[PDB]
């Protein structure tokens, strides 16, 4: 089998590539000006990294990044795409008179064969919390086509996590779960399922944005170097943390966001999804605790955020956190595949 | 005596100690709606007092007896069980009414009066009207009432109505979920979560609210003090059938009460409804542990059962259902330990 | 099984995961019209349930089976294919009804019932009535129905009506014209504008509307669940002849549906019509690619052909013409991927 | 028993009913300073608990016994007189510590413990430290303490200090002057004005205040729980001689208290001082009937005599004089019925 199939449930792959086969979704990604513009800036301002070079675009979709590479003077670009969007990319390559420079290769990057090794790999494989969709693994897998001296755009990825307080959000989810608390819904006693319901709602990472004032400690950083990492490194991601609490209050969970860096020869360009930066279509992600932890300012909040890759192109998240001064511990399970889009 | 038989000593001690404080008397006296309405009911029905023999059940500072004196009563027996009776006597003397107000120290169930009275005055209303169980003392005092004599107040109406207030609900649920946490300073409290919910939701909420939270016109339960007997208040069964005017979550039942002084010249009402100026009685709300969903036009039916206990209060049982769907709620409350919000 | 042959693995997995969530069951349960009307239909026809054998096809949380129990059913077989079946089992135990409700995990096409039933209950309706193809499971279950048996619901009416909505129509070109720009970050996107238009118009629109946009009395197509077979729903041909009540441009066809519970005591209706309180089904509108002009009194005639596909949905083919002018329009829609427009 | 001999039954009923409420236990438990400092004192002195026999006097919810268990205690006898004992028993079971914690329902003066203990833990402090008279139970429990055994807390300090607060003083007369009107609804109430003043001044005021109202360093009275007998708390005579730091009118005495946990590893202090974060004990102020003028450098001397009564509280007798001027004032207060002024 291919590396993709061996790690991916068929149902998930079918659904996944059907999602990206729609022009409306491509439009949605393209209209994220921060993203699209920052990519174009990272590529054009490092034009020497592309000038007369061989390029691989992993998961090119409509092909916009391959066009940026073409603008930067790349002589040959292999644009790999597994969804049917590949046909639409071909249309744009012809209508933009770039048939001699951009070559669409339909299929999964783990299964196609490229005619030659490339000087640089470009891609946008970041999902929610950076790791959702497991496309970073495809990105890393594609390094089998990278020359020894090769480069990756983006080059590194930073995941930031920080504790937050937000009673409204907490109560908003708790209210949804308490439906299953009723002893007589149309005469039916549902309460025996309330535990299972709370679990289910709190299993949902919350995707949306927020005021930075809800953050109770400076973030902890976890970095993935795309030039150095291997695929298998992402099957199990262990992020330890030790927060020094800047404010007193209830910690309702952990907030996540990510930065990527295009480390080019001319300059390094950053693409950030932090809540201190303009909103992107990645927003930010929050994992709620079923029971918040009370912490005093100056306390230490320690524990681990554990990501286990599953066959549905996503991760099982286990977060365990503890207030060191009191031993108050919280353990939580989340399913990154199924988030709650709150925005 | 009837009083001691139905009352635990500990409760009685705490109860009469409470009313022995001048500050509390000041509190009741500075409720202007209450005091003014009482004075109005007595003075505008002055003929019901003119040259009459009066009994004041639980006179406290004696203010109602002074109102009776202002209206021309010939002799007023002011019975008071707390030490406040001493202070009432001081005021009787300093107001030169020794010939018209006679203070009787002791419980109305135990003291001896020299004669029968033409009219009984008292202010025995508690939270939900019935808290403190003083209405029974008031009814008990009718053994001193001449056959056609009168009662001030004459009747009392308890009003019930369903309400929606998720803020209140979640405010209490938040308090109970403290006992939900699996690691408080490392200790798992969750096994007590149920007991915590029960305790918190047993508490009637005393406070006021905007009338728009009411989802149906109130149902009325009436006690006629002229006809009622003491024993009638031992077990109070209030059936209700609400016709829902609004759709939404019913979080519980709101209670308040009116009393009427049905005098010969006019009927004067004293009201604690949320549509009227606030009194020191406020209003009382009983929460359901789980709210009931109802659409407008539905009927909410059930029973409110009040059982008198030896702690001078009531055990409250509320059973309610949305008839159209069978959605049912049952709740037990302890009027003894309310939440003053 | 009959189910597996008519359903792609990929679609079935996503489908039963969807219904495995308590929140989704809750969403259906909190539709008061839906749930209350089912309860009302069952309880007010208690003679159809008193001491009877009942089958609940796709019981979900088990709510309809509890309604059957409230009506006095002797035995209810509650069949459920998703993982919700266990939660249903929990509720049966905690409601002390284990001696009357038997939860059978699995597809109704694959499980075996120990005996024949007197009545079948189910809520198999999707958008436009037919979406999700669960009506076929409902009909398939009649192999367990006594010759005497009844179906709750008994019949289903799909209503079609022509509408005018200039804003909805123009919205499609407004969204698609994103691609009609010669230099999006230096890329000429215009060659995909046509494909983007096609994509938007293939989407049935889910939401509600003011009834004044309807330009003719609806045409009705009826399925009698007592008489129909599974195969009858593989190819559904709905001819129509609308007599225009208003003059104007016809932008497409609006769809909604009613079902009726024809019991021994009374008939109870559940309607999702735009004249009734909103339900979670809303209404569905299929646009014409080219609007048709009609004067009041003119006739709009044609056909709506629904062809079942293995993605548990239908390919919708609509052809319409104004008989007085001969001016014609078409459209092909994919009911599996509707556009949820409601806000 | 010793308890009944010193306690009126009505008061005892009221007292244990109060602590039978989960809300009251929660009130004490959510005091982070109190609870955190107990936990800290116990855990940081783990050698005082490891494999030891512990007695928890008035365990309430059992929170301190769990701390003793966290510190490695071999066996903990948790004695509790109210109905909270059953709830503590539940938590012991649900926290799997039935082999380490034994809940004993009943009064510590009445129950039978099987063996002597190495250390006694308790939180028996009331307002002004001594209110509720539970410290005597704590000391009484030493009949179960091995010689050389320890007490947590080990000592208790009550602090007294003179204060100025013109607002607080005038307030008593503002409230009592309600009665000083010749026609309240036609009634001359003035004859009760003196009695009203007396009543207000007998009430110790419970609430907090700005430390700038304090006019001299506090005088400290220390009870060593390892050395003291219960009978030592029946008549507590606190002489004082304040060296005035500020000039002005002294309106009364402010009270607060500290306890110290003197362990083998370290001493941990729990303070309810007005210089520390607020606790549920707040502080207590007792007024003089007549304020005393004092110049900075003067000495204010006298006595605070606390006399235990059968209502689980004290009659407070304060006599004070400005030594340089001979100006004298006194007050007699009823600690059982304090005025909760805090807002
Ligand atoms: C929705 O929110 C934004 N977003 C975007 C992306 C990236 N996108 C699209 C980017 C691309 N269209 C462009 O324009 O750069 C993924 C694209 O890559 C394709 N793809 C994925 N795994 C593949 C594989 N093994 N082999 C070949 N192609 C593969 C897939 O079909 C898409 O066309 C993401 N990872 N998470 C997100 O949340
Ligand atoms: C929370 O709100 C306050 N509140 C106030 C009152 C009224 N007050 C004073 C009434 C009168 N002094 C006036 O001034 O109106 C009651 C007075 O009645 C006395 N009393 C009670 N049972 C007695 C008995 N068997 N024998 C003799 N005296 C008895 C008791 O000692 C008080 O002094 C009330 N009934 N319900 C309330 O809720
Ligand atoms: N062929 C099938 N066999 C068994 N269950 C099915 C089948 N097709 C759909 N279902 C289930 O049928 C349910 C339809 S949703 C209706 C749920 C529930 N009866 C209620 O009235 O609230 C979903 O829970 C599906 O998982
Ligand atoms: N003589 C006594 N014997 C047993 N328990 C008592 C006695 N006097 C008071 N108590 C209880 O002691 C507790 C004091 S409150 C402290 C509770 C708990 N140890 C904590 O630290 O949170 C209350 O639960 C009282 O009921």
UniProtKB/Swiss-Prot annotation, chain B:
Post-translational modification remark: Phosphorylation at Ser-82 is strongly increased during mitosis, and decreases rapidly to a very low, basal level after entry into the G1 phase of the cell cycle. Phosphorylation at Ser-82 interferes with S-adenosyl-L-methionine binding and strongly reduces methyltransferase activity. Phosphorylation at Ser-82 may promote cytosolic location. Methylation enhances transcription coactivator activity. Methylation is required for its role in the regulation of pre-mRNA alternative splicing.
Disruption phenotype: Neonatal lethality. The lungs of neonates do not inflate and they do not breathe. The same neonate lethality is observed with mutants that produce CARM1 protein without enzyme activity. Embryos are distinctly smaller at 18.5 dpc. They show reduced lipid accumulation in brown adipose tissue and reduced amounts of brown adipose tissue. Thymocyte differentiation is blocked at an early stage. Mutants display complete loss of protein methylation of the CARM1 substrates PABPC1 and EP300/P300.
Name of the featured protein: Histone-arginine methyltransferase CARM1
Modified residues (Phosphoserine): 82
Reported impact of residue 82 to A: Loss of S-adenosyl-L-methionine binding. Loss of protein methyltransferase activity. Localized in the nucleus
Residue span relative to the full protein: 136 to 476 of 608
Regulation: Methylation of H3R17 (H3R17me) by CARM1 is stimulated by preacetylation of H3 'Lys-18' (H3K18ac) H3 'Lys-23' (H3K23ac) by EP300 and blocked by citrullination of H3 'Arg-17' (H3R17ci) by PADI4.
Biological processes per GO annotation: cell population proliferation; endochondral bone morphogenesis; estrogen receptor signaling pathway; methylation; nuclear receptor-mediated steroid hormone signaling pathway; positive regulation of cell population proliferation; positive regulation of fat cell differentiation; positive regulation of transcription by RNA polymerase II
Subcellular localization(s) per the UniProt record: Nucleus; Cytoplasm; Chromosome
EC number: 2.1.1.319
Residue ranges constituting the SAM-dependent MTase PRMT-type domain according to the UniProt record: 12-319
Impact noted for substituting residue 34 to A: Loss of protein methyltransferase activity
Keywords: Chromatin regulator, Chromosome, Cytoplasm, Isopeptide bond, Methylation, Methyltransferase, Nucleus, Phosphoprotein, S-adenosyl-L-methionine, Transcription, Transcription regulation, Transferase, Ubl conjugation
Family of this protein: Belongs to the class I-like SAM-binding methyltransferase superfamily. Protein arginine N-methyltransferase family.
Gene Ontology CC: cytosol; nuclear replication fork; nucleus; protein-containing complex; RNA polymerase II transcription regulator complex
Keyword Glycosyltransferase recorded: no
Broad enzyme group: transferase
Organism field: Mus musculus (Mouse)
Major site of localization recorded for this protein: nucleus
Residues annotated as binding S-adenosyl-L-methionine: 25, 34, 58, 80, 109, 137
GO molecular function: histone H3R17 methyltransferase activity; histone H3R2 methyltransferase activity; histone H3R26 methyltransferase activity; histone methyltransferase activity; protein methyltransferase activity; protein-arginine N-methyltransferase activity; protein-arginine omega-N asymmetric methyltransferase activity; transcription cis-regulatory region binding
Subunit structure: Homodimer. Interacts with NR1H4. Interacts with SNRPC. Interacts with the C-terminus of NCOA2/GRIP1, NCO3/ACTR and NCOA1/SRC1. Part of a complex consisting of CARM1, EP300/P300 and NCOA2/GRIP1. Interacts with FLII, TP53, myogenic factor MEF2, EP300/P300, TRIM24, CREBBP and CTNNB1. Interacts with RELA. Identified in a complex containing CARM1, TRIM24 and NCOA2/GRIP1. Interacts with NCOA3/SRC3. Interacts with SKP2. Interacts (via PH domain-like fold) with C9orf72. Interacts with PARP1; promoting PARP1 recruimtent to replication forks.
Superkingdom classification of source: Eukaryota
The reaction(s) this protein catalyses: L-arginyl-[protein] + 2 S-adenosyl-L-methionine = N(omega),N(omega)-dimethyl-L-arginyl-[protein] + 2 S-adenosyl-L-homocysteine + 2 H(+)
Chain intervals for the UniProt region annotation (Required for nuclear translocation): 212-245
Cross-link (Glycyl lysine isopeptide (Lys-Gly) (interchain with G-Cter in ubiquitin)): 93
């Amino acid at each position: 089998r291919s590396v993709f199939s061996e790690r991916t449930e068929e149902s998930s792959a079918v659904q996944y590539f059907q999602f990206y086969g729609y022009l409306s979704q491509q439009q949605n990604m393209m209209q994220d000006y921060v993203r699209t513009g920052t990519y174009q800036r990272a590529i054009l301002q490092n034009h020497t990294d592309f000038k007369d070079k061989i390029v691989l675009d992993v998961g090119c979709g409509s092909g916009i990044l391959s066009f940026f590479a073409a603008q930067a003077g790349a002589r040959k670009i292999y644009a790999v795409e597994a969804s049917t969007m590949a046909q639409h990319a071909e249309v744009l390559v012809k209508s933009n008179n770039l048939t001699d420079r951009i070559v669409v290769i339909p299929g999964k990057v783990e299964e196609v064969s490229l005619p030659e090794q490339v000087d640089i790999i470009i891609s946008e494989p970041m999902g929610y919390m950076l790791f959702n969709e497991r496309m970073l693994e495809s990105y890393l897998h594609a390094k089998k086509y990278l020359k020894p001296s090769g480069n990756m755009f983006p080059t590194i990825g930073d995941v930031h996590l920080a504790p937050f307080t937000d009673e409204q959000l907490y109560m908003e989810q708790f209210t949804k779960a308490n439906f299953w608390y009723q002893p007589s819904f149309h005469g039916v006693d549902l309460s025996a399922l309330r535990g299972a319901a709370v679990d289910e709602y709190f299993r949902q990472p919350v995707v949306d944005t927020f005021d930075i004032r809800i953050l109770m400690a400076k973030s902890v950083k976890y970095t993935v170097n795309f030039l150095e990492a291997k695929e298998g490194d992402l099957h199990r991601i262990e992020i330890p943390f030790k927060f020094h609490m800047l404010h007193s209050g209830l910690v309702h969970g952990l907030a996540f966001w990510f930065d990527v860096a295009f480390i080019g020869s001319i300059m390094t360009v950053w693409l950030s999804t932090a809540p201190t930066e303009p909103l992107t279509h990645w927003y930010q992600v929050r994992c709620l605790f079923q029971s918040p932890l009370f912490a005093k300012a100056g306390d230490t909040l320690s524990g681990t955020c554990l990501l286990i890759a599953n066959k549905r192109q996503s991760y099982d998240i286990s977060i365990v956190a503890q207030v060191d001064q009191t031993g108050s511990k919280s353990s939580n399970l989340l399913d990154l595949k199924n988030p709650f889009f709150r925005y």
